[PDB]
Amino acid sequence: MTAIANRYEFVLLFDVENGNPNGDPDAGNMPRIDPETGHGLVTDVCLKRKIRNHVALTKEGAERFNIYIQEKAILNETHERAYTACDLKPEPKKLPKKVEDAKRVTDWMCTNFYDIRTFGAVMTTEVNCGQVRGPVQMAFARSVEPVVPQEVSITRMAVTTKAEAEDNRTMGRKHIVPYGLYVAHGFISAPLAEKTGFSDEDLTLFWDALVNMFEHDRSAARGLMSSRKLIVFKHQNRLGNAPAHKLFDLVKVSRAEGSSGPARSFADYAVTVGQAPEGVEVKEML
């Protein structure tokens, strides 16, 4: 399968209403924030996980579309499959000495694990399968305006173990962002796609996953999250015709003139996309 031939940048805008887009293991489970400025954060791994889940849901484990980082997978066991398929036997912590065999095992890992093919992977465990960078990269999503994470206290009318607590009900608490608009940048590298085989079919599936990423991520903690705008910059040739930061500056997010007070809807914001350089086209219609 031929790899993609063009370089891509893209910008994703997504919302959250009365939800926790990404909890922080250190701050209890509060939404991640930049403590110096109060802007919310969503890790790249969080979004990559949602793309992985969407791919798994929509392809249902079809061939060439398996997910390497699964909920209950044991990675070394998956590594053994590559060696078995390629008929080598793993050295205790090292790749096969024959560089061709190492390339074969790494390609087998890439050829049928979509997330390895896309986001790369580090597989230098006991059953060593090598490393992959992956053409697609994402940066931390950051809210356009500071978020005020309010803390909600809830009670449960039942107890788990044998306890005499209930005198007051069992206590628990959620953390939610009343509303926040997040901007996520991303890059797709044609040179790396040529190494992993990331094809145009994979790229279309990736756009679909970004568009429909949150539609099947509903839960008791997430609230309502939705993808609002996906602007894709496609370069005319294998290497870019313009700097990435210059393209990202074309997407400007500001608050609608008629809106006041704290933002509580996407309508409180106005999004403008400028003119791209001569070597780049914007597929904003996504």
């Binding site: 701050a27 209890g28 509060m30 924030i33 403590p35 110096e36 400025t37 109060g38």
Partner: peptide, 22 residues
């Protein structure tokens, strides 16, 4: 189980005007 010590200590010190009202 938890106190403001666990969650708001960093932001209060780094950005007092944003969190002390809460």
């Amino acid at each position: 189980n938890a106190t403001i010590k666990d969650r708001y200590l960093a932001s209060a010190s780094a950005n007092p005007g944003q969190v002390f009202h809460m």
